[PDB]
Amino acid sequence: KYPITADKRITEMVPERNEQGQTLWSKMRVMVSPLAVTWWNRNGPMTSTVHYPKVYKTYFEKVERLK
Amino acid sequence: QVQLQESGGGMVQPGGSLRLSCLASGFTFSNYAMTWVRQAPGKGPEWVSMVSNNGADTTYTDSVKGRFTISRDNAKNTLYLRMNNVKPEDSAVYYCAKRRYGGIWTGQPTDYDYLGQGTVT
Amino acid sequence: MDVNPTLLFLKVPAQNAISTTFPYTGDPPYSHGTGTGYTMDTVNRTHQYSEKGKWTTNTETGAPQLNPIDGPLPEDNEPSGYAQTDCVLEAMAFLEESHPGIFENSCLETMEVVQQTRVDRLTQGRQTYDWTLNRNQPAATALANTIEVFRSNGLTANESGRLIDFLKDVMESMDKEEMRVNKRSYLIRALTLNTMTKDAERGKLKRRAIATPGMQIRGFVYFVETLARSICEKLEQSGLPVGGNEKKAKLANVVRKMMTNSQDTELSFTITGDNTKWNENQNPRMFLAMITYITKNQPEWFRNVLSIAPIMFSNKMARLGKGYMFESKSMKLRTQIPAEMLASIDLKYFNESTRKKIEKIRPLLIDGTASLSPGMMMGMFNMLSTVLGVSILNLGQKRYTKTTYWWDGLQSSDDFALIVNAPNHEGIQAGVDRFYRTCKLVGINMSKKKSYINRTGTFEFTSFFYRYGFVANFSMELPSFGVSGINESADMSIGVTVIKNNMINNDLGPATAQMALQLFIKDYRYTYRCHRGDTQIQTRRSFELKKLWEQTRSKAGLLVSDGGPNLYNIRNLHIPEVCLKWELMDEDYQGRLCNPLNPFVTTHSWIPKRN
Amino acid sequence: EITGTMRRLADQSLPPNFSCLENFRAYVDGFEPNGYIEGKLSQMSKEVNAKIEPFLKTTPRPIRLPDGPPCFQRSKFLLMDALKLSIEDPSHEGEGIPLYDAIKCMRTFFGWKEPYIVKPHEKGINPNYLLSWKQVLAELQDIENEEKIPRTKNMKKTSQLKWALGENMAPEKVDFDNCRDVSDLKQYDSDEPELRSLSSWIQNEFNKACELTDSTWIELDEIGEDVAPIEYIASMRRNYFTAEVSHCRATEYIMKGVYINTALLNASCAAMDDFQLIPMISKCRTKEGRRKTNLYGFIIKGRSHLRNDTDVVNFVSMEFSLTDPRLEPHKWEKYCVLEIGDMLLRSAIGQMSRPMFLYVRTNGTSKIKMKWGMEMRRCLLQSLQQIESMIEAESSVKEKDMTKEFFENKSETWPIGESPKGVEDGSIGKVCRTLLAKSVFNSLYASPQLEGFSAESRKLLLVVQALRDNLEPGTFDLEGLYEAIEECLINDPWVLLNASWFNSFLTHALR
Amino acid sequence: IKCMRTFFGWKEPYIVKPHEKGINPNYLLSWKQVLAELQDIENEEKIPRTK
RNA sequence: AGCAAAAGCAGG
């Protein structure tokens, strides 16, 4: 377990265990679990910013050529 | 013209099996995805399964996983559904329908065409 | 009842069903044992090929070097690397006469590239031979090694950043008598070339023993191969630098150009095959002569800095490898014997075939490493050899064969495909015997065993089999179709990009490529455990997937590593995944994804803990 | 910045006629062609010339297979005679550490007689392998009944297993000076091995291995929808393909091999110093039920420290068997067959009650062969690639471009069978199966003999197609092809059978 | 464990009934300890028969 | 004993 590595900053945002109790991160930075990711994507800050298509909007243009 | 005539249904005993067939004619079959949608007497319909054009992307309801197996044969332009371990609550009238688009997930499960028949156990 | 796939191969056309004779769907055999025996046999074979040629010892080396050129004409059809430089020069002369201005233009391209080039490019190689540890090592460590030893030396070109000054100062300190290594030992150590048995040689029984060069010669071969790439790009008969479907069309185009039979009162055959002993019967002397002729009327310094490669080809002392591992039968004990002492040991512990090989080579051993230069180094991507051999095909312009019959075609590094014409079987036999003779007079040996000949329409070349108009190809086998092993964000991307490259370049049909993507996503999920949300399979993770999968608003619009479906197919492979999903996703998920608050930066991306 | 010493080396590198770099450069720069080539040609011996010949219809003699002892099997797991103790369709949420699924399946079967050997090995020591199997059964019952459920079990060191893997068989590295005094030493017994003769057993194994098993053996998921044309053509081709392939026994061997090799590589990279038990376990979905974990056979992995990937790892393998030995004792000179009593098979009438024997052979594979046996899904894919290449060729020669023209029609168009005084024809189904199984055996009996044969049979068959279509082919030296083929036919049965197939092909084609 | 593994639908624990005596949060954290202990033993230990 | 081959493993 614990394939993923990441900083200590994540420790504040999310718990050490989920509802079932299986762990997201543990110390010997902290090792983080892949479950930790899928916990972010269920509950996390929602923000309607469109800055990240700064350059990712390029690929949409290539798809408009297809469809 | 587009018509969907289904068959293979009948009476069975609880915990058995059934093989529902649906023959479609009048349109380009290999292009559109297909759906099984059932309706129990008294309750509005509920979608049973959605199957792709390739027959590779399949999706079932949250209460029928492991018991059902949906498939299709493009030669005779036909749709097969294998129901195993029939629970008493699956006792409803089953419906074969042809999706609006060729997709499965694009849009919520709703159809725009006709229907055949369905048996009850 | 008995069964056979050979009879489906009976009826079916051979070239279309040829892949059935492509059994490479399993691990290649490899060489468990030290290649040194195969090396000794290769050296024995090439020195036997040039035994008529005289040799004289090189100064400061102690080593016999054989010069086959200006040797006699061969006696027997058995191959032998005997050639005459005049043939080479008149060949290149007819070439430039045929293709005017091509030489000077490629030369100017070489000038501008050497002026613009930089040392930073060469270090991105694989297993250049280092001289300190006396073992093949990576190229970055190699560059660090040479620049630090040069910092110790009196030269200062590693600080310059340019490259030709770097090669020049390599040469200057290479002429030094001490570094902690004397001049003779150092010149034997710089010219040394690891033996390093071939691995993955598909389609043989015994092993070729590909030997590899070091970094110091690598830049010289880089420059001359850049010239070769330019001149072959401006050529129409090369096969190596031309590639992909353009190469596929070039094959068909040359057979078009020569198969058109105006006044077809003459029968026509079109050879294919494989020129055996390509890396043996050739020679660097012919290469140096070619080089001198190619850069006519140019800056003298360029002439020199591009002639330096064939000369150090012309004297090279490759190693032999590890050695052997003798063993006691009764007492049952074994040891490795480094062959550096092989020029001292008795000739009784060994095997008899091995023994006779040793006595053949034991004279030819100086510092233990075998010396030889009648023959090319095994397995280099030279392609100036194609520039050579294609001139032969150019001789069969009817102006210059000066007879009724005439040849033409194309020729990559080992394969070759002539196309001839003559009024009868007798005339074609006459002209092809003339060609085979000529091709030997330049020191190129067309084998008579594993080659053949036929009417036009069907001919092999470089495995791009060409039946009448069909151009099936089996150049390289499909590789792996498995994850790259980095992260759920880019592994998928890497796999799709690899699939796209191998369908666009090679002949991965889409019918197999969808299935390849299918196996790939299966492996992706089974590795990262992350099957579909709407499933019934269990694992560690599946809790959160079955949680988020209902948590969503748009269900199919999800990335695959978290419960999502794979909307890829052969239409939309170059694009990434989240571009295809983005506006099919709701702002909660999309906002959770692209956010600098993630430690992940692309939130699926990350670094795994080292192990 | 030549420094002259390079001019020295250069002037020494040149041909003998010219002694300097500068005279060479002046000669070349001042060079012109004067028709030297014709003087060279006329000067030459006429002996040195490549003479064509008519590669006539009656010329190519039947390639003579080598003669010697009978060919013997070397597969890492037997192929036709094996059987599988089912699990009877467990649930869908219950994962299983594989030992417990195996144990459950071994627990299912009763019919264990006392072990007594049925085949004399003729070498080694048969009783020791008997007692090895005994240790296995005892260890398994003892761990599971009365310990804290260990996920993975490694056996106990004994005379039996330690003999059958030879942890003492290693000699030790030493310096040269201390042993040069000894005269017993030899470089190595590096020589050709014993010849072998073709026999009938491998043909039977292949025939069984092309045949349809009953189950499905492989699933396949969904992919993005299909809009463009080429997408639909790819979809239909792959669907036809996988549906035809899935009911193979070749695909059974495929998943079996993949799981076996993955398990072994996991173990060896993760565990070296310990004799491990592993099952030959494979996951198969029943056509009409649930997922089924079949137990083919146990494994006793031998210790594995892989300083290089090329290195061999040795082990012992136990795969159950119904069919008796001594019907084909040539097929194995290597097995060590035990008796393990009866299994009560049920036929349409009565009950068979045939005995049960076990083939506790030993072996050793590799790291590399394990990797390439893990990647046999590629081999399946490669069979698809070949079929698609055939069909694209038929689409280029005929613009119909019709996959459906061949994939499903009832049309006898493909011969793969040779019968007494007959040739059988089959459909694309049998042929896709056969091409697959050929590639699988290529993946199992991969050996340089095969690659040599492949190149040489390829060239000669190409020449024979050139002949049969009246394309006036020629070959300069032919007995070279024949002797090199005979060189590559050393011992491998699969090679040998491809050669007998080549032979009968020559005969029935008549070229 | 297999049956508890079957069910999904676990929200965060917050008490719904005031005990009016004792300490409700402590029983909440007891239940938390239970779930955590069960997942932790079964995922990453040598399968103890009784915990 | 075995693997597999014109040389190596069978632990360092």
mmCIF file of N, CA, C and O in Angstrom, chain C residues 240-278:
data_model
loop_
_atom_site.group_PDB
_atom_site.id
_atom_site.type_symbol
_atom_site.label_atom_id
_atom_site.label_comp_id
_atom_site.label_asym_id
_atom_site.label_seq_id
_atom_site.Cartn_x
_atom_site.Cartn_y
_atom_site.Cartn_z
ATOM 1 N N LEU C 240 16.984 3.527 -45.795
ATOM 2 C CA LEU C 240 17.045 3.697 -44.342
ATOM 3 C C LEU C 240 16.446 5.025 -43.893
ATOM 4 O O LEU C 240 15.470 5.013 -43.123
ATOM 5 N N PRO C 241 16.954 6.189 -44.320
ATOM 6 C CA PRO C 241 16.410 7.435 -43.759
ATOM 7 C C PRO C 241 14.998 7.703 -44.228
ATOM 8 O O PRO C 241 14.169 8.195 -43.452
ATOM 9 N N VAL C 242 14.700 7.387 -45.489
ATOM 10 C CA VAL C 242 13.319 7.361 -45.934
ATOM 11 C C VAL C 242 12.601 6.288 -45.134
ATOM 12 O O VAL C 242 13.136 5.196 -44.909
ATOM 13 N N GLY C 243 11.391 6.599 -44.680
ATOM 14 C CA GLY C 243 10.717 5.715 -43.752
ATOM 15 C C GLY C 243 9.223 5.929 -43.760
ATOM 16 O O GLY C 243 8.697 6.816 -44.438
ATOM 17 N N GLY C 244 8.545 5.091 -42.986
ATOM 18 C CA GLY C 244 7.109 5.127 -42.921
ATOM 19 C C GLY C 244 6.482 4.837 -44.269
ATOM 20 O O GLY C 244 7.038 4.135 -45.129
ATOM 21 N N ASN C 245 5.296 5.408 -44.468
ATOM 22 C CA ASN C 245 4.573 5.175 -45.707
ATOM 23 C C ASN C 245 5.243 5.852 -46.892
ATOM 24 O O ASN C 245 5.030 5.428 -48.030
ATOM 25 N N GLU C 246 6.075 6.867 -46.657
ATOM 26 C CA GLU C 246 6.873 7.427 -47.742
ATOM 27 C C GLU C 246 7.857 6.394 -48.277
ATOM 28 O O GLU C 246 7.995 6.226 -49.493
ATOM 29 N N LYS C 247 8.560 5.700 -47.382
ATOM 30 C CA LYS C 247 9.403 4.578 -47.792
ATOM 31 C C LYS C 247 8.582 3.498 -48.487
ATOM 32 O O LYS C 247 9.011 2.922 -49.504
ATOM 33 N N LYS C 248 7.422 3.177 -47.912
ATOM 34 C CA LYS C 248 6.517 2.203 -48.506
ATOM 35 C C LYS C 248 6.183 2.572 -49.943
ATOM 36 O O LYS C 248 6.104 1.704 -50.820
ATOM 37 N N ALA C 249 5.990 3.861 -50.196
ATOM 38 C CA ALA C 249 5.716 4.342 -51.540
ATOM 39 C C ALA C 249 6.964 4.360 -52.401
ATOM 40 O O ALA C 249 6.870 4.203 -53.616
ATOM 41 N N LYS C 250 8.130 4.565 -51.794
ATOM 42 C CA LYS C 250 9.362 4.637 -52.566
ATOM 43 C C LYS C 250 9.683 3.296 -53.193
ATOM 44 O O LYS C 250 10.130 3.224 -54.345
ATOM 45 N N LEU C 251 9.484 2.229 -52.424
ATOM 46 C CA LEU C 251 9.603 0.873 -52.949
ATOM 47 C C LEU C 251 8.754 0.700 -54.206
ATOM 48 O O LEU C 251 9.254 0.352 -55.294
ATOM 49 N N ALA C 252 7.453 0.952 -54.061
ATOM 50 C CA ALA C 252 6.522 0.812 -55.167
ATOM 51 C C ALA C 252 6.893 1.726 -56.326
ATOM 52 O O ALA C 252 6.705 1.364 -57.489
ATOM 53 N N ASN C 253 7.472 2.888 -56.030
ATOM 54 C CA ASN C 253 7.785 3.853 -57.073
ATOM 55 C C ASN C 253 8.968 3.397 -57.904
ATOM 56 O O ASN C 253 8.971 3.561 -59.127
ATOM 57 N N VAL C 254 9.994 2.840 -57.266
ATOM 58 C CA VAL C 254 11.140 2.388 -58.047
ATOM 59 C C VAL C 254 10.751 1.185 -58.891
ATOM 60 O O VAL C 254 11.153 1.074 -60.063
ATOM 61 N N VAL C 255 9.943 0.276 -58.333
ATOM 62 C CA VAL C 255 9.516 -0.843 -59.169
ATOM 63 C C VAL C 255 8.609 -0.354 -60.285
ATOM 64 O O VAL C 255 8.613 -0.922 -61.377
ATOM 65 N N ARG C 256 7.820 0.692 -60.045
ATOM 66 C CA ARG C 256 7.057 1.303 -61.127
ATOM 67 C C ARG C 256 7.988 1.811 -62.216
ATOM 68 O O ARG C 256 7.810 1.513 -63.402
ATOM 69 N N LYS C 257 8.992 2.588 -61.813
ATOM 70 C CA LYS C 257 9.874 3.258 -62.756
ATOM 71 C C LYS C 257 10.631 2.270 -63.624
ATOM 72 O O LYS C 257 10.924 2.570 -64.786
ATOM 73 N N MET C 258 10.969 1.101 -63.076
ATOM 74 C CA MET C 258 11.772 0.126 -63.812
ATOM 75 C C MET C 258 10.959 -1.010 -64.422
ATOM 76 O O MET C 258 11.456 -1.681 -65.333
ATOM 77 N N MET C 259 9.734 -1.241 -63.953
ATOM 78 C CA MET C 259 8.909 -2.326 -64.464
ATOM 79 C C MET C 259 8.173 -1.920 -65.728
ATOM 80 O O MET C 259 7.803 -2.788 -66.526
ATOM 81 N N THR C 260 7.918 -0.625 -65.899
ATOM 82 C CA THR C 260 7.395 -0.115 -67.159
ATOM 83 C C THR C 260 8.292 -0.563 -68.302
ATOM 84 O O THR C 260 9.470 -0.201 -68.366
ATOM 85 N N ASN C 261 7.729 -1.381 -69.187
ATOM 86 C CA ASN C 261 8.492 -2.106 -70.199
ATOM 87 C C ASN C 261 8.055 -1.590 -71.561
ATOM 88 O O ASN C 261 7.191 -2.173 -72.219
ATOM 89 N N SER C 262 8.666 -0.490 -71.979
ATOM 90 C CA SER C 262 8.495 0.016 -73.327
ATOM 91 C C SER C 262 9.291 -0.867 -74.274
ATOM 92 O O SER C 262 10.443 -1.209 -73.996
ATOM 93 N N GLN C 263 8.661 -1.250 -75.384
ATOM 94 C CA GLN C 263 9.258 -2.186 -76.334
ATOM 95 C C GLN C 263 9.606 -3.495 -75.630
ATOM 96 O O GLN C 263 10.743 -3.971 -75.673
ATOM 97 N N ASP C 264 8.607 -4.083 -74.975
ATOM 98 C CA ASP C 264 8.837 -5.264 -74.153
ATOM 99 C C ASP C 264 9.069 -6.502 -75.007
ATOM 100 O O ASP C 264 8.252 -7.429 -75.010
ATOM 101 N N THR C 265 10.185 -6.522 -75.730
ATOM 102 C CA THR C 265 10.665 -7.721 -76.399
ATOM 103 C C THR C 265 11.667 -8.485 -75.545
ATOM 104 O O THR C 265 12.311 -9.413 -76.047
ATOM 105 N N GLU C 266 11.804 -8.117 -74.270
ATOM 106 C CA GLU C 266 12.843 -8.634 -73.394
ATOM 107 C C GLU C 266 12.206 -9.150 -72.116
ATOM 108 O O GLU C 266 11.334 -8.490 -71.543
ATOM 109 N N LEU C 267 12.634 -10.329 -71.680
ATOM 110 C CA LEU C 267 12.182 -10.848 -70.403
ATOM 111 C C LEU C 267 12.916 -10.126 -69.278
ATOM 112 O O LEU C 267 13.955 -9.493 -69.485
ATOM 113 N N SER C 268 12.346 -10.208 -68.080
ATOM 114 C CA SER C 268 12.808 -9.413 -66.954
ATOM 115 C C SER C 268 12.658 -10.205 -65.668
ATOM 116 O O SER C 268 11.599 -10.784 -65.412
ATOM 117 N N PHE C 269 13.721 -10.227 -64.871
ATOM 118 C CA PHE C 269 13.711 -10.784 -63.531
ATOM 119 C C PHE C 269 14.170 -9.709 -62.557
ATOM 120 O O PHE C 269 14.796 -8.722 -62.945
ATOM 121 N N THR C 270 13.820 -9.891 -61.282
ATOM 122 C CA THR C 270 14.004 -8.855 -60.264
ATOM 123 C C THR C 270 14.458 -9.523 -58.971
ATOM 124 O O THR C 270 13.636 -10.003 -58.188
ATOM 125 N N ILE C 271 15.766 -9.521 -58.741
ATOM 126 C CA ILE C 271 16.332 -10.216 -57.598
ATOM 127 C C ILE C 271 15.907 -9.536 -56.306
ATOM 128 O O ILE C 271 15.594 -8.341 -56.272
ATOM 129 N N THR C 272 15.867 -10.321 -55.236
ATOM 130 C CA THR C 272 15.922 -9.833 -53.872
ATOM 131 C C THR C 272 16.978 -10.631 -53.125
ATOM 132 O O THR C 272 17.658 -11.481 -53.702
ATOM 133 N N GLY C 273 17.110 -10.369 -51.838
ATOM 134 C CA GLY C 273 17.921 -11.225 -50.996
ATOM 135 C C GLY C 273 18.532 -10.457 -49.839
ATOM 136 O O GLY C 273 17.971 -9.474 -49.364
ATOM 137 N N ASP C 274 19.686 -10.961 -49.412
ATOM 138 C CA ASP C 274 20.407 -10.430 -48.268
ATOM 139 C C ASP C 274 21.881 -10.640 -48.558
ATOM 140 O O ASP C 274 22.307 -11.762 -48.846
ATOM 141 N N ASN C 275 22.644 -9.557 -48.513
ATOM 142 C CA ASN C 275 24.057 -9.596 -48.834
ATOM 143 C C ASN C 275 24.803 -10.040 -47.590
ATOM 144 O O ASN C 275 25.003 -9.250 -46.663
ATOM 145 N N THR C 276 25.211 -11.303 -47.567
ATOM 146 C CA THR C 276 25.860 -11.854 -46.389
ATOM 147 C C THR C 276 27.148 -11.115 -46.084
ATOM 148 O O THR C 276 27.772 -10.513 -46.961
ATOM 149 N N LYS C 277 27.546 -11.183 -44.821
ATOM 150 C CA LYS C 277 28.853 -10.713 -44.389
ATOM 151 C C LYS C 277 29.034 -9.230 -44.687
ATOM 152 O O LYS C 277 30.130 -8.769 -45.012
ATOM 153 N N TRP C 278 27.939 -8.485 -44.581
ATOM 154 C CA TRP C 278 27.978 -7.057 -44.850
ATOM 155 C C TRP C 278 28.928 -6.352 -43.903
ATOM 156 O O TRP C 278 29.733 -5.511 -44.316
#
